[PDB]
Amino acid sequence: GSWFFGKIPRAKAEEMLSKQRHDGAFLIRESESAPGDFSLSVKFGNDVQHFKVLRDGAGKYFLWVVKFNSLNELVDYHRSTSVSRNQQIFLRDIE
């Protein structure tokens, strides 16, 4: 299903992802910190991590240092490059 949840509150995103069986279950939402901000929310075991997704001066999105022309490309990238640097966790659709 669609991974984009608009303005879902942070706590509701945590509630939703905490029910998931697979690490890497995720959503993208529109977060509260600044206008236009997105956040990637991801299940890691008993935790849900939030990662701000900001835009650079060219309009590209990023979590750390790789830049993307779209949210879909950011998601695509993390279906096969881990969102953890300690263990292999790829983004996986909510079930």
From Swiss-Prot:
- Phenotype upon changing residue 33 to N: No effect on the interaction with SOS1
Compartment(s): Nucleus; Cytoplasm; Endosome; Golgi apparatus
Q: Name one GO molecular function term.
A: phosphotyrosine residue binding
Q: What is the effect of changing residue 32 to K?
A: No effect on the interaction with SOS1
Q: Main location per UniProt?
A: nucleus
Q: What do the Gene Ontology cellular component annotations say?
A: cell cortex; cell-cell junction; centrosome; COP9 signalosome; cytoplasm; cytosol; endosome; extracellular exosome
Q: Which domain of life is it from?
A: Eukaryota
Could you confirm whether the keyword Thylakoid appears in this record?
Answer: no
- Which residues are recorded with the post-translational modification N6-acetyllysine? 52
Keyword terms of this UniProt record: Acetylation, Cytoplasm, Endosome, Golgi apparatus, Host-virus interaction, Isopeptide bond, Nucleus, Phosphoprotein, Repeat, SH2 domain, SH3 domain, Ubl conjugation
Which sites are covalently linked via Glycyl lysine isopeptide (Lys-Gly) (interchain with G-Cter in ubiquitin)? 52
Q: Where is the SH2 domain?
A: 3-95
Biological-process GO terms, alphabetical:
actin cytoskeleton organization; B cell receptor signaling pathway; branching involved in labyrinthine layer morphogenesis; cellular response to ionizing radiation; endodermal cell differentiation; epidermal growth factor receptor signaling pathway; fibroblast growth factor receptor signaling pathway; insulin receptor signaling pathway
| PTM | Ubiquitinated by RNF173, leading to proteasomal degradation and inhibition of the RAF/MEK/ERK pathway. In the nucleus, polyubiquitinated by RBBP6 at Lys-52 at DNA damage sites.
Describe the effect of residue 52 to R: Loss of polyubiquitination
The UniProt family comment states: Belongs to the GRB2/sem-5/DRK family.
Q: How does it assemble?
A: Homodimer. Associates (via SH2 domain) with activated EGF and PDGF receptors (tyrosine phosphorylated). Interacts with PDGFRA (tyrosine phosphorylated); the interaction may be indirect. Also associates to other cellular Tyr-phosphorylated proteins such as SIT1, IRS1, IRS2, IRS4, SHC and LNK; probably via the concerted action of both its SH2 and SH3 domains. It also seems to interact with RAS in the signaling pathway leading to DNA synthesis. Interacts with SOS1. Forms a complex with MUC1 and SOS1, through interaction of the SH3 domains with SOS1 and the SH2 domain with phosphorylated MUC1.
The protein's role, per its UniProt record: Non-enzymatic adapter protein that plays a pivotal role in precisely regulated signaling cascades from cell surface receptors to cellular responses, including signaling transduction and gene expression. Thus, participates in many biological processes including regulation of innate and adaptive immunity, autophagy, DNA repair or necroptosis. Controls signaling complexes at the T-cell antigen receptor to facilitate the activation, differentiation, and function of T-cells.
| Domain comment in the entry | The SH3 domains mediate interaction with RALGPS1 and SHB.
Protein name as it appears in the record: Growth factor receptor-bound protein 2
Organism, by scientific name, is: Homo sapiens (Human)
